[PDB]
């Protein structure tokens, strides 16, 4: 095929991974036992799933958490049969919200079977594109073991692509004070390897389920379901194949103008309560309008005071090319949308024709046509500066550093990673300058 | 770059510490796998780093950090030369009722042990020999000073005496005054080849991946009427090791490296504490700080830092941290 | 990280260990004899954190009980849930310390220490993912302080990568008979600052004050306090006996709590306040719960936090209430008193909620506070101590038992630098 391989690390990455493959099975039509009614035991979905012998369609995913409580739910849940059991790899002592225990002490002893098993998945394929890594920016497991894991995947698989799905931490459900440290570290070490990192502000997801779903204290469940829906919008152009959708690797090329500038703000269109019923479907024009409201955004930032460098729209459901073009006309000049003087102000659109299947009892009101926009804007730097502030107070007094150094790492790695962060911010500046 | 330069030379300032830096040359490993030399020294006063940077747009450029110091030793000068300006003008101190010291700060592979522990013409041996050549001199013998020496290691956050074959020693304070290294065997010497003997007692009694894995303190003590008069310490520390350089796991090697970087962290925060004066400098943070307390804030104390740095591009991160703290030292 | 091995020694320490195992053996649903008599399975998802399993529905408390006084063990057998303790785990000396630190550290405790280390050994040889070690004791006496600190040192040098947690109590001339206590205290601190990870501080002065002013008990008995401490213990162990994302294991617990390696002295506090066997008809709400458990009238150590600043806090609420109400009152206390929090550490207060409430309450709230005001507790002792070591009273006890005498002024310089460390991070703005 043109296969892919998903990887899910840490509490967040594993739970959100379960929501993701949940939705994958729903949309593509598979029951928790791994059987499909329509297939013949080389299709658009045979990139994310492999066929066994008895038509037991099985994912191409490796799950890892250093403390097996979060993966044991997989082997007790409805999909315990779905998985090849050898790729539900678990440790013993959780990294304890400590990056250095991921990157050095704990991860070293497990990485080798992690990659013998990822190997066991890669030998199944005939032409693998890249790996999809799902992890959190916060917890020790997902930061450390992903930084190292990528440092290894770049050795064993240099030619291949590597797409990050990253979970910016929200103070409301933050389970640690040292979240800035972990985030800055794993961004620093992961940058030169990863090709494209989709960022998810947990704060933003919380606000979404505060407004449009009207949940007062949304559980981790609600958030994982919503994020899963968005990820399904992004991957849908990989998992289906009409004459009107192009590869995510086709317009990945257009989203990343510079090697270090590979963070596309995402935006997802209709988000409405299934409880708060009585609803008129939205036109292509209305959801294309919503794709520019900071409410329906993924990261907490403000693109109106920032410049654009690209724009992608992945529509799914009922969409005619002319509807898209007209909506794009209504949006083009009527708004204060700005491009850098070195970039064509063009849009590429992936029309996928499968509707958005929501969740049984999933408080996502099912809809007929949706759009997910990937905008590579310079205002995303906000989310970095929100980090480097919460950082540069603590690191100003070196508070909490003694743990990370106490599990192997030096101090100078901090001043280096931070200096590199400020460098990245000044790069998101240098993008904005013009010429004459 | 490199050549096509160096017209201007060095007119410095008044310091509170003799801060100096040594550059070691590349070896067979960094040359076979052709690493690059990114440190140059044109005058005995200027350390230049050629930080290889890259703009956002992949245009390679050079961030040319310049670091003036007390003295800059390049990739040639032997232990003699380093001793002559780092430790030698410090022998004067201890004879004149003084308490001097000497640092070996750098990264693992920068050459601290080779400058202190030789191979065996190290600054231990050389400083001792200049102690016993001046004690011959007429106006120094007219003091009848009895010479002693100690040699002990901090490892795993505890103190062991190398002359007394790895015996555990406590560390106490009491009445301010001094930090009393309780239990320390203090061996009397009266000639240079006594000192060489104690030296190769400790150098081989040390814990040892063929590198000095413990903090070495080598004292040369003076006692007139038995009461303390002089104390010159010579210190070979472990280097600040990366962590990003993965040791081959090992249950005790990670203990060692972690404790090393934690002691060096405490020391480092005490540097950045004195540089701006926090009225509570955190010296009771680690055993190492608890020691160097009087090496810094002693009443009649002098001291010297011999910094060491590798010249390879791979080391440049470490190198810049070491030089940056050596700059924040010069006060 | 799962298994936690628990140990109690000294009069006070054994006592409070008993009260602990009482309230938590009821909350987990274990009967006095040792069979599961619960209702909800919420009490068994993380039961393995404090009990080994003898096959046959026998929950053996992974615990060890020690004393140099041969008596003590009697108070165990009369402990209503005391038969559940494993036979081998009873290791009791027969000399007795009599309020002497050096007798417990360099003398007789030096003899029984290796007897305890073997039972600890065979306790760790049967643990899947051994978390760390959790101890209970007292500081003003003889056995607990000394033998405790020695034990911590040897465990530390045999288990360096396991968390070191200690629940220590304080002497004060309001409950302590003798006055050899401002010595054993400073010694114990000298070892704790250098060998432990976490440390919870309980002041006898605070428990007397609460028993007299609030509970109106003019004549405070010695169990009236053990009640008050066991409650707090259940409150701060909730995060380790029940499931939840926040404060899962002890490593995580110290991570969001320990900004600097030495500063690790907490000031627990509980709301509401009750006497023994007296339930709450007008059981407390939420704004009074959080408005009390951050005031000083419910704290467990004689330290007014309003004088200092909070470094970190971990609030825990138990029962069934509203989540939004919880987090809202938390941040309300935070920002209406942002003048009491180091603004250079943000997101510093972490609050979780557990379903099962404590016994006798329907809604409760525990407090854990690493404040800069804790130095007031250490400026008091270094005053009862510098006023007795400048006079050298009773020094033939310790010094005449193999102790250095300067291992005292060592502890005075150590604690008098610690005080300067808590005062350091009290006025450092985010410049
Ligand atoms: N959206 C979402 N975020 C999560 C979830 N679980 C954890 N997080 C985020 O992750 C951060 C904490 O890291 P975790 O992922 O829980 O920790 P971990 O990866 O299991 O690593 P350890 O805790 O050391 O085992 C918090 O700030 C949360 O916001 C989840 O299920 N969904
Ligand atoms: N001036 C010099 N010229 C040539 N080689 C040198 C010089 N100084 C040091 N070296 C080399 O540096 C190597 C490492 O020395 P050493 O001081 O033991 O490393 P280190 O800095 O001590 N690492 P560590 O043991 O953790 O302290 C020696 O084997 C020498 O070959
Ligand atoms: N709250 C409380 N304090 C106690 C108890 N027993 C002793 N103490 C205190 O602990 C100090 C030392 O007493 P003791 O426990 O007999 O000494 P130790 O066992 O050798 O540590 C005294 O000052 C008492 O105030 C107790 O049961 N409860
Ligand atoms: Mg985990
Ligand atoms: Mg060395």
Size of interface B-C (CB pairs under 8 A): 44
Could you give the C-alpha distances from C131 to B254, C35, C161, in angstroms and in order? Answer: 19, 25, 9
Q: Do B317 and A412 touch (CB under 8 A)?
A: yes
Residue B261 lies in a domain: yes
Q: Which of B111, B123, B234, B237 to mutate to test the pocket of ligand 2 (most atoms within 8 A of CB)?
A: B111
Ion ligand 4: protein residues whose beta carbon lies under 5 Å: A 11, 65, 67, 94, 141
The answer on A415 and A309 residing in a single domain is: no
Contact call for residues B125 and B199 (beta carbons, < 8 A): yes
> For residue A47, what are its two tokens?
């990139």
| Whole-angstrom distance, CA of residue C24 vs CA of residue C234 | 7
Rounded to an integer, what distance in angstroms lies between the CA atom of residue C196 and that of residue A246? Answer: 59
Q: Which residue ranges of B are tagged as binding site for ATP?
A: 106-113
Q: Are residues A396 and A324 in the same domain?
A: no
Domain final position from A264, A297, A324: A264
Q: In the structure encoding, which two tokens stand for residue C415, read together?
A: 């604690």
**Residue B9 within any structural domain of the chain:** no
Nearest beta carbon to residue C409 from set B175, B278, B280: B175
Question: Is there a single domain that holds both residue A104 and residue A4?
Answer: yes
Contact A108 B249 (CB under 8 A): yes
For residue B12, tell me if it sits in a domain. Answer: no
Q: Which own/partner pairs from A205-213 qualify as long-range (CB within 8 Å, at least 24 positions apart)?
A: A205/A170, A206/A170, A206/A172, A206/A173, A207/A295, A207/A300, A208/A271, A208/A295, A208/A296, A211/A295, A212/A271, A212/A272, A212/A273, A212/A295, A213/A271, A213/A273, A213/A363, A213/A364
- Structural domain boundaries, residue B171: 18-328
| Chain centroid offset of residue C123 CA | 21
Name the β-bridge partners of A88.
A63
State which ligand 2 atom lies nearest to the alpha carbon of B22: 1
Helix (H, G, I), strand (E, B) or coil at C144: helix
Same domain, A283 and A230: no
A174 shares its domain with A316: no
Distance C255 CA to ligand 4 centre (A): 15
Of B172, B193, B267, B185, which is closest to residue B219 (Cα–Cα)? B185
Question: Which residues sit opposite A261 in a β-bridge?
Answer: A258
C-beta of C64 in contact with ligand 3 (< 6 A): no
Cα(A98)–Cα(A393) distance, integer angstroms: 19
What is the C-alpha separation between A418 and A412, in angstroms, rounded?
10
Residue A334 has phi, psi (to 5 degrees) of -60, -15
The CATH number of the domain holding residue B76 is 3.40.850.10
Residues A146 and A157 in one domain: yes
Count the Cβ atoms, other than its own, within 10 Å of residue A256. Answer: 18
- Is the domain of A85 the same as that of A127? yes
Residue with CA closest to ligand 3 atom 28: C12
Contacts of A130 by beta carbon, 8 Å cutoff, 6+ apart: A4, A5, A160, A161, A162, A163, A195, A249
Token pair of C345, please?
A: 């550490």
Q: Which residues of C are annotated as a binding site for GTP?
A: 11, 69, 138, 142-144, 204, 226
* PDB resolution in Å: 3.5
H helix count then E strand count, chain B:
10, 16
Distance (angstroms) between ligand 2 centre and the Cα of A100 equals 28
Tokens of C220: 């405070």
3-state secondary structure of C164: strand
Which ligand has the minimum distance to the alpha carbon of residue A13? 1
Radius of gyration, CA atoms only, chain C: 21
* Residue C316, phi then psi, degrees to nearest 5: -135, 125
Retrieve residue C192's tokens: 């704790």
Beta-strand relationship, C130-138 and C163-170: parallel
Q: What residues of chain C have any CB closer than 8 angstroms to a CB in chain B?
A: 160, 193, 260-262, 404, 406-410, 413-414, 417-418, 420-421, 423-424
Q: φ, ψ for residue C351 (rounded to 5)?
A: -125, 125
User: What is the total count of domains within chain B?
Assistant: 1
Round to whole Å and give the CA distance between A34 and A32: 5
Q: Exposed e or buried b for every residue in A170-206, given b needs 16+ CB within 10 A?
A: beebbbbbbbbbbbbbbbbbbbeebbbbbbbbbbbbb
The continuous run of DSSP H or E covering C383 comes out as helix C375-384
Q: Which domains, ranges and CATH numbers included, belong to chain C? A: 1-259 (3.40.50.1440), 260-373 (3.30.1330.20), 374-431 (1.10.287.600)
Containing structural domain, residue A2: 1-264
Question: Rounded to whole angstroms, how far apart are CA atoms A266 and A292?
Answer: 10
CB A326 within 8 A of CB A285: yes
Closest chain C residue to B277, measured at CA? C424
Instruction: Say which residue the tokens 């004899």 belong to.
Output: C33
CB B262 to CB A406 under 8 A?
yes
Closest by alpha carbon to A249, among A348, A354, A356? A348
Give me the helix-helix angle, A179-191 and A412-430, nearest 10°: 70
- Out of A379, A401, A420, pick the residue that ends a domain: A379
CA-nearest residue to A70 within chain C is C245
CA C362 to chain centre: 24
Helix, strand, coil tally for chain C in percent (to 5): 40, 20, 40
A85 and A214 belong to one structural domain: yes
Task: Specify if B4 maps to a domain.
Answer: no
Method for this entry? X-ray
Q: Give CA separation, B224 vs B174, B198, B233, C256, C355, in Å.
A: 24, 22, 18, 54, 73
Q: Is B244 helix (H, G, I), strand (E, B) or coil?
A: coil
Q: Is A250 one of the catalytic residues?
A: yes
Three-state SS string over chain A comes to CCEEEEEEEHHHHHHHHHHHHHHHHHHHCCCCCCECCCCCCCCCCCCCEECCCCCECEECEEEEECCCHHHHHHHHCCCCCCCCHHHEEECCCCCCCCHHHHHHHHCHHHHHHHHHHHHHHHCCCCCEEEEEEECCCCCHHHHHHHHHHHHHHHHHCCCCEEEEEEEECCCCCCCCCCHHHHHHHHHHHHHCCCCEEEEEEHHHHHHHHHHCCCCCCCCHHHHHHHHHHHHHHHHHHHHCCCCCCCCHHHHHCCCCCECCECCCEEEECCCCECCCCCCCCCCHHHHHHHCCCHHHECCCCCHHHCCECCCEEEEEECCCHHHHHHHHHHHHCCCCCCECCCCCCCCEEEEECCCCCCCCCCCECCCCEEEEEEECEHHHHHHHHHHHHHHHHHCCCCCCHHHHHCCCCCCHHHHHHHHHHHHHHHHHHHCCCCCC
In the beta sheet, which residues pair with residue C299?
C269
Residues B165 and B225 sit within 8 Å (Cβ to Cβ): no
Please indicate, yes or no, whether residues A260 and A274 belong to a single structural domain of this protein.
no
Count up the domains in chain A and report the number: 3
Q: Write down the residue that tokens 């958005």 correspond to.
A: A356
Could you say which of A86, A250, A410, A429 is catalytic? Answer: A250
Quote the crossing angle between the two packed helices A202-211 and A220-239, to the nearest 10°. Answer: 100
A336 shares a domain with A228: no
Same domain, A79 and A223: yes
Cα separations in angstroms, C156 against A229, A264, B292, C192, C377: 49, 49, 25, 11, 26
The three state secondary structure string of C230-260 is HHHHHHHHHHHHCCCCCCCCHHHHHHCCCCC
DSSP 3-state assignment of C73? helix
Q: Which residues fall within 8 angstroms of residue B137, CB to CB, at 6 or more apart? A: none
- Of the residues A231, A264, A297, which one is the last residue of a structural domain? A264
Residue B192, H or E segment: helix B192-205
Q: Is the peptide bond before C272 cis (omega within 30 degrees of 0)?
A: yes
3-state secondary structure of C94: coil
Q: Are A380 and A298 in contact (CB under 8 A)?
A: no
Q: In 3D, which of A16, A55, A18 has the Cα closest to residue A36? A: A55
DSSP code string of B149-168: EEEEEEETTEEEETTTTSEE
Counting every residue, how long is chain A?
436
* CB-CB contact of B49 with B316 (8 Å): yes
A251: which strand partners?
Answer: none
- Do A361 and A221 fall into the same domain? no
Distance separating alpha carbons of residues C358 and C364, to the nearest angstrom = 7
Residue A80's Cβ-count burial label (10 Å; 0-12, 13-18, 19+) is middle
> Ligand 3, atom 14: nearest CA belongs to which residue?
C141
What is d(CA A395, CA C302) in angstroms, rounded to the nearest whole number? 32
Please say whether the beta carbons of B296 and B233 come within 8 A.
no
* DSSP code at position C385: T
């Amino acid at each position: 095929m043109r296969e892919c391989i998903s990887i899910h690390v840490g509490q967040a990455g594993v739970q959100i991974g379960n929501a993701c493959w949940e939705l994958y099975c729903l949309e593509h039509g598979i029951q928790p036992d791994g059987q499909m009614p329509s297939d013949k035991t080389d299709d658009s979905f045979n990139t994310f799933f492999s066929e066994t012998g008895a038509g037991k369609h099985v994912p191409r995913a490796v799950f890892v958490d250093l403390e097996p409580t979060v993966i044991d739910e997989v082997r007790t849940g409805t999909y315990r049969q779905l998985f090849h059991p050898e790729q539900l790899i678990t440790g013993k002592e959780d990294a304890a919200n400590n990056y250095a225990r991921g990157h050095y002490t704990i991860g070293k002893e497990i990485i080798d079977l992690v990659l013998d098993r990822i190997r066991k998945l890669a030998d199944q394929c005939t032409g693998l594109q890249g790996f999809l890594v799902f992890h959190s920016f916060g917890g020790g497991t997902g930061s450390g073991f992903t930084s190292l894991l990528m440092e290894r995947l770049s050795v064993d698989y240099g030619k291949k692509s590597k797409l990050e799905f990253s979970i910016y931490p929200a103070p409301q459900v933050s389970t640690a004070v040292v979240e800035p440290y972990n985030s800055i570290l794993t961004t620093h070490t992961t940058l030169e390897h990863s090709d494209c990192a989709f960022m998810v502000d947990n704060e933003a997801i919380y606000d979404i389920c505060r407004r449009n779903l009207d949940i007062e204290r949304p559980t981790y469940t609600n958030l994982n379901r919503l994020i899963s829906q968005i990820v399904s919008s992004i991957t849908a152009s990989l998992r289906f194949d009409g004459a009107l959708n192009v590869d995510l690797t086709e317009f990945q090329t257009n989203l990343v103008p510079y090697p270090r500038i590979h963070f596309p703000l995402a935006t997802y269109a209709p988000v409405i309560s299934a409880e708060k019923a009585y609803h008129e479907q939205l036109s292509v024009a209305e959801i294309t309008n919503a794709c520019f409201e900071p409410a329906n955004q993924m990261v907490k930032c403000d693109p109106r005071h920032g410049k654009y460098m690209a724009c992608c729209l992945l529509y799914r459901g009922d969409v005619v090319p002319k509807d898209v073009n007209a909506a794009i006309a209504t949006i083009k000049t009527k708004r204060s949308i700005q491009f850098v003087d070195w970039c064509p102000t063009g849009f590429k659109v992936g029309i996928n024709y499968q509707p958005p299947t929501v969740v049984p009892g999933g408080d996502l009101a099912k809809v007929q046509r949706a759009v997910c926009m990937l905008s590579n804007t310079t205002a995303i730097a906000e989310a970095w500066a929100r980090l480097d502030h919460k950082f540069d107070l603590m690191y100003a007094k070196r508070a909490f550093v003694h743990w990370y150094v106490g599990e192997g790492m030096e101090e100078g790695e901090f001043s280096e990673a931070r200096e590199d962060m400020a460098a990245l911010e000044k790069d998101y500046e240098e993008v904005g300058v013009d010429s004459v | 770059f490199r050549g096509s330069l160096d017209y201007r030379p060095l007119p410095i300032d008044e310091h509170r510490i003799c801060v100096c830096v040594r550059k070691r040359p590349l070896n067979k490993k960094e040359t076979q796998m052709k690493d690059l030399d990114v440190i140059t020294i044109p005058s005995k006063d200027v350390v230049m780093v050629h930080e290889p940077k890259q703009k956002v747009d992949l245009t390679r450029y050079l961030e040319n950090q310049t670091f003036r110091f007390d003295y800059a030793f390049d990739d040639s000068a032997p232990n003699e030369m380093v001793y002559r300006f780092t430790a030698r003008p410090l022998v004067e101190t201890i004879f004149e009722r003084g308490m001097a010291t000497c640092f070996a700060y750098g990264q693992t592979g920068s050459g601290k042990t080779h400058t202190m522990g030789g191979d065996s013409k190290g600054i231990y041996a050389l400083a001792a020999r200049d102690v016993f050549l001046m004690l011959k001199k007429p106006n120094y013998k007219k003091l009848e000073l009895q010479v002693y020496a100690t040699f002990f290691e901090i490892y795993s956050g505890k103190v062991f005496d190398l002359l007394n074959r790895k015996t555990k020693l406590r560390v106490l304070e009491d009445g301010k005054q001094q930090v009393q290294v309780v239990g320390l065997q203090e061996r009397e010497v009266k000639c240079v080849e006594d000192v060489l003997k104690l030296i190769d007692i400790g150098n081989s009694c040390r814990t040892s991946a063929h590198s000095s894995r413990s903090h070495a303190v080598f004292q040369i003590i003076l006692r007139r009427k038995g009461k303390l008069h002089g104390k010159f310490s010579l210190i070979d520390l472990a280097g600040n090791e990366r962590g990003a350089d993965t040791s081959s796991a090992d249950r005790q090697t990670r203990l060692e490296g972690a404790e090393i970087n934690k002691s060096l962290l405490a020391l480092k925060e005490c540097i950045r504490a004195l540089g701006r004066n926090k009225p509570h400098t955190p010296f009771r943070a680690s055993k190492l700080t608890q020691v160097l307390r009087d090496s810094f804030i002693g009443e009649n104390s002098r001291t010297c830092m011999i910094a060491t740095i590798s010249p390879g591009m791979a080391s440049c991160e470490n190198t810049l941290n070491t030089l940056r703290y050596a700059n924040r030292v010069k006060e | 990280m799962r298994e936690i091995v628990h140990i109690q020694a000294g009069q006070c320490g054994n006592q409070i260990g008993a009260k602990f195992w009482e309230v938590i053996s009821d909350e987990h649903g274990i009967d006095p004899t040792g069979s599961y008599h619960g209702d909800s399975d919420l009490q068994l998802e993380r039961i393995n954190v404090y009990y080994n399993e003898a096959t046959g529905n026998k929950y053996v408390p992974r615990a060890i009980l020690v004393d140099l006084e041969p008596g003590t063990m009697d108070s165990v057998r009369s402990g209503p849930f005391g038969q559940i303790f494993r036979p081998d785990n009873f290791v009791f000396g027969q000399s007795g310390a009599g309020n002497n630190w050096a007798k417990g550290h360099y003398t007789e405790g030096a003899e029984l220490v290796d007897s305890v280390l073997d039972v600890v050994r065979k306790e760790s040889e049967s643990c899947d993912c051994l978390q760390g070690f959790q101890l209970t004791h007292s500081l003003g006496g003889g056995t607990g302080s000394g033998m405790g600190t020695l034990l911590i040192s040897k465990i530390r040098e045999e288990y360096p990568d396991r968390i070191m947690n200690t629940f220590s109590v304080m002497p004060s001339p309001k409950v302590s008979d003798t006055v050899v206590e401002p010595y054993n205290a400073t010694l114990s601190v000298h070892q704790l600052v250098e060998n432990t990870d976490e440390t919870y501080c309980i002041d006898n002065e605070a428990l007397y004050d609460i028993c007299f002013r609030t509970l109106k008990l003019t004549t405070p008995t010695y169990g009236d306090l053990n009640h008050l401490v066991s409650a707090t213990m259940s409150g701060v162990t909730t995060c380790l006996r029940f499931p939840g994302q926040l404060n899962a294991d002890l490593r995580k617990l110290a991570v969001n709590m320990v900004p600097f390696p030495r500063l690790h002295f907490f000031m627990p506090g509980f709301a509401p306040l009750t006497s023994r066997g007296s339930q709450q008809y007008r059981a407390l709400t939420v704004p009074e719960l959080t408005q009390q458990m951050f005031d000083s009238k419910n704290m467990m150590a004689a330290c007014d936090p309003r004088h200092g600043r909070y470094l970190t806090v971990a609030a825990i609420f138990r029962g069934r209430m509203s989540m939004k109400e919880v987090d809202e009152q938390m941040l309300n206390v935070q920002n209406k008193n942002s003048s009491y929090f180091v603004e250079w550490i943000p997101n510093n207060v972490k609050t979780a909620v557990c379903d099962i409430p404590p016994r006798g309450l329907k809604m409760s709230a525990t407090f854990i506070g690493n404040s800069t005001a804790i130095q007031e507790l250490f400026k008091r002792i270094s005053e009862q101590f510098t006023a007795m070591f400048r006079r050298k009273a009773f020094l033939h006890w310790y010094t005449g038992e193999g102790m250095d005498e300067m291992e005292f002024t060592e502890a005075e310089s150590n604690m008098n630098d610690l005080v300067s460390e808590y005062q350091q991070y009290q006025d450092a703005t985010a410049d």
